[PDB]
Ligand binder design. Structure first.
Ligand SMILES: Nc1ncnc2c1ncn2[C@@H]1O[C@H](COP(=O)(O)OP(=O)(O)OP(=O)(O)O)[C@@H](O)[C@H]1O
Ligand SMILES: Nc1ncnc2c1ncn2[C@@H]1O[C@H](COP(=O)(O)OP(=O)(O)O)[C@@H](O)[C@H]1O
Ligand SMILES: Nc1ncnc2c1ncn2[C@@H]1O[C@H](COP(=O)(O)OP(=O)(O)O)[C@@H](O)[C@H]1O
Lengths: 48, 370, 355
């Protein structure tokens, strides 16, 4: 969706409405940080 | 005629109109009107010295100048003050609980209390608790007793309590106070018991006040274990209510009519005799009473003389008059279906079975009486 | 005769009359453009030996403006938030009050845009409540001339995912009037009278804003079936329940602001809300059949064009005991996987994921 290459037409209107990246204490939110670095300057904030 | 009829147009446009120059002056008069500060005279220091509490600020003392009738001023009277004119320029009576006033003086146009059937015993109970003490005090003078204070109504949520309360309210419509017993809560810590004392004072002003408040269980409670600050505000509000209605000084010609749904959870301190003189349970409507209510609800209905009312009575059981206008309604848009001018008995049968199947689902239709 | 003298006075006396209030109004409207003190009306019906007022000012003061020199007490009913002169210490003009913090905007949607076409399956029921709610809005004058006051309380009971929320909002959109949504399961407040206060200002807000749609959810949570055990006797929630009861008759004249209560099991209610003048229209919301479920998900996936010619018949066979919400989740699950299954086989796993 951040690349916005195909969300508008080929797939239905909008990309999937959300992500729940859960899991036991471990890899959780590290993939989020990796996605943040791989994406544009619209970068995440870690709220508790 | 042209010089006649053209006149009759132009002055009528005004009359009530062209009533603006003085309205303008009045609001200009307001523009340079002095706003006089308002307090309550706690006590009279001397014949010319009067100790007055500003409703918010400190107690000042003021003094009537020449003709303000210092004799009629009393400790606790309302007077207008000015931080500049040094005196009282005029005196002012009291207040009337405005929020309560309009919601107690906006009783909608109801029908007579004779339009509800099966509660004639409750009707005569209301007559010999309200009308009798004021119409004939000579008989009770020969008796030598005080009239009773209040009566309680309780039972299934559908009885006619709101209809009876609205009917007795429509009987007077001038000295009847309605209370819903839930607007007592507010943002501020104050104005909780202040209002309660205020319409009690209003009940002191007018002797034949009939006070009606509903859901005593909304303030009652049994006992609060590990009470919260909101729970603690109930118990002081309940205690203030108790000591202002029974307390040390009693009311005169003021009767309280209250209703609820859970009699067991009520606080035993309130329901003891002396505060609640009579307890009345409004039971299930009778089968012939349900027949009368059905006829009342089916009065202005286009129908012919084939309706089996006895069949409705046999099938519809345990159904308050509430469920009966449902049946009358359900026959209504059944008649709307297929565009039928009249209402057929089959529509009532469809209504009865649909309401009966509706009522099957719900259990515990009524609390057991105390 | 005597016209030409009369009107040369009259038209002059008309225009000069109105000009001075135009002056005066300005002289008081700038003051009305600078009010500073809230109006905690503590009224006296002070008949002049007509009325009068006490105003608890914002700065903690009280001002007894005589006979309320500007606003009639018929419209100046007591309350708060009504213009008061900052200099003249007089009532200035009415203004909107405060809607009890939470009720100011709890979840109030200004205008819903969901359409009636995207919902279906229970078309007989949806048309039934449209006749009982939407028609009393658009053709309200038809009921007025007929003489029958439309019923207001519609109770829509059925397992979750039957489209009650969409139908209520779609009906509100069709009426083109105000829609107010109540979070029913969260009306149980530890503060005393809080839920009672919330429902009041919700009714007050609905009355002040058009013939509205009061969509109270979780009526079973609001009202217990009176099955009284000491574990919980529904003591503090009976507070709010009868409060909702006494506000159901507030809008009986002029028949505006309808009440729509959504729940799953109607049997968990005592015969209090099931009243003819109160909630009377109970409409069943069953789980849609295979045809209806297939049509519902087809309408949901109408905005998706990835897999042509999917009759959804195998989906209807595999959509046993599923809700419209489950059908939407099934179709959007395809909307998440149908990248680069696809046809008649990317639908089953949606239900399997939730459990
Ligand atoms: N796949 C991984 N590769 C490398 N390091 C990882 C990986 N998963 C977790 N870690 C390490 O784990 C630590 C915290 O991981 P992460 O930020 O994902 O979790 P968190 O925010 O601390 O919470 P939780 O463990 O509950 O998900 C970091 O030091 C990170 O390097
Ligand atoms: N005994 C009765 N006679 C006539 N109508 C009744 C009766 N009981 C209930 N109703 C119907 O119920 C509605 C009034 O509600 P009500 O039962 O008075 O509330 P509550 O019982 O909480 O006071 C009215 O529409 C009225 O037609
Ligand atoms: N007939 C229908 N048409 C379209 N969507 C529906 C339908 N029925 C249910 N839904 C879906 O169900 C969801 C509403 O769920 P919810 O309001 O919790 O169910 P209920 O109203 O039965 O309690 C919506 O997001 C909607 O997509």
């Amino acid at each position: 969706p951040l690349l916005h290459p195909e969300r508008f037409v080929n797939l239905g209107i909008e990309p999937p409405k959300g992500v729940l990246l859960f899991g036991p204490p471990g890899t959780g939110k590290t993939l989020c940080a990796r996605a943040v670095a791989n994406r544009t300057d619209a970068c995440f904030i870690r709220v508790i | 005629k042209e010089i006649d009829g053209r006149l009759k147009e132009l002055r009528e446009q005004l009359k009530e109109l062209t009533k603006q120059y003085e309205k303008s002056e009045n609001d200009l008069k307001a523009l340079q009107s002095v706003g006089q500060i308002v307090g309550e005279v706690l006590k009279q220091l001397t014949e010319e010295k009067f100790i007055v509490k500003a409703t918010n600020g400190p107690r000042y003392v003021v003094g009537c100048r020449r003709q303000l009738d210092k004799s009629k001023l009393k400790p606790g009277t309302r007077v207008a003050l000015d931080m500049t004119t040094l005196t009282i320029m005029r005196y002012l009576p009291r207040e009337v609980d405005p929020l309560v006033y309009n919601m107690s003086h906006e009783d909608p146009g109801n029908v007579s209390y004779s339009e509800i059937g099966g509660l004639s015993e409750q009707i005569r109970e209301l007559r010999e608790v309200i009308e009798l003490p004021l119409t004939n005090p000579e008989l009770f003078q020969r008796v030598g007793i005080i009239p009773p204070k209040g009566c309680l109504l309780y039972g299934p949520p559908g009885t006619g309590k709101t209809l009876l309360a609205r009917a007795v309210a429509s009987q007077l419509d001038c000295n009847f106070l309605k209370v819903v017993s839930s607007s007592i809560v507010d943002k501020y810590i104050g104005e909780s018991a202040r209002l309660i004392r205020e319409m009690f004072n209003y009940a002191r002003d007018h002797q034949p006040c009939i006070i009606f408040m509903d859901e005593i269980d909304a303030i009652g409670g049994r006992r609060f274990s590990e009470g919260t600050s909101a729970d603690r505000e109930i118990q002081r509000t309940l205690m203030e209510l108790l000591n202002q209605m029974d307390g040390f000084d009693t009311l005169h010609r003021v009767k309280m009519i209250m209703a609820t749904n859970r009699p067991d959870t009520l606080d035993p301190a309130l329901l003891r005799p002396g505060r609640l003189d009579r307890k009345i349970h409004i039971d299930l409507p009778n089968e012939q009473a349900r027949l009368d209510i059905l006829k009342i609800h089916a009065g202005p209905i286009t129908k012919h003389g084939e309706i089996d009312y006895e069949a409705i009575v046999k099938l519809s059981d345990g159904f308050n008059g509430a469920d009966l206008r449902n049946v009358c309604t359900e026959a209504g848009m059944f008649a709307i279906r297929a565009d039928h001018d009249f209402v057929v008995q089959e529509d009532f049968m469809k209504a009865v079975r649909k309401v009966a199947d509706s009522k099957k689902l719900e259990s515990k239709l009524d609390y057991k009486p105390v | 005769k005597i016209m030409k003298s009369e009107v040369l006075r009259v038209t002059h006396e008309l225009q000069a009359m109105k000009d001075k209030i135009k002056e005066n109004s300005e002289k008081i409207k700038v003051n009305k453009t600078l009010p500073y003190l809230v109006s905690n009306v503590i009224e006296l019906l002070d008949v002049d030996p007509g009325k009068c007022a006490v105003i608890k000012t914002s700065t903690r003061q009280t001002y007894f403006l005589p006979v309320i020199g500007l606003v009639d007490a018929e419209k100046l009913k007591p309350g708060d938030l009504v213009g008061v002169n900052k200099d003249s210490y007089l009532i200035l003009e009415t203004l909107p009050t405060e809607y009890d913090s939470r009720v100011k905007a709890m979840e109030v949607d200004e205008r819903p845009t969901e359409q009636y076409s995207d919902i279906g399956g229970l078309d007989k029921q949806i048309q039934e409540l449209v006749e009982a709610i939407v028609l009393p809005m658009n053709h309200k004058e038809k009921f007025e001339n007929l003489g029958i006051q439309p019923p207001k309380g519609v109770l829509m009971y059925g397992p979750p995912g039957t489209g009650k929320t969409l139908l209520a909002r779609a009906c509100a959109a069709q009426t083109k009037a105000t829609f107010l949504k109540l979070a029913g399961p969260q009306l149980v407040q530890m503060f005393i009278g809080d839920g009672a206060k919330l429902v009041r200002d919700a009714f007050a807000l609905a009355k002040e804003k058009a013939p509205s749609i009061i969509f109270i959810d979780e009526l079973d949570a609001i009202g217990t079936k009176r099955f009284d055990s000491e574990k919980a006797g529904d003591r503090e929630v009976q507070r709010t329940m009868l409060e909702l009861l006494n506000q159901l008759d507030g809008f009986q004249p002029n028949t505006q602001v309808k009440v729509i209560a959504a729940t799953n099991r109607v049997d968990i209610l005592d015969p209090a809300l099931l009243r003819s003048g109160r909630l009377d229209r109970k409409i069943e919301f069953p789980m849609p059949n295979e045809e209806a479920r297939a049509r519902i998900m087809q309408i949901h996936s109408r905005k998706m064009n990835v897999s042509p010619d999917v009759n959804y018949e195998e989906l209807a066979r595999c959509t046993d005991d599923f809700n419209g919400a489950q059908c939407k989740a099934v179709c959007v699950e395809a909307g998440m996987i149908a990248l680069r299954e696809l046809t008649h086989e990317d639908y089953m796993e949606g239900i399997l994921e939730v459990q």
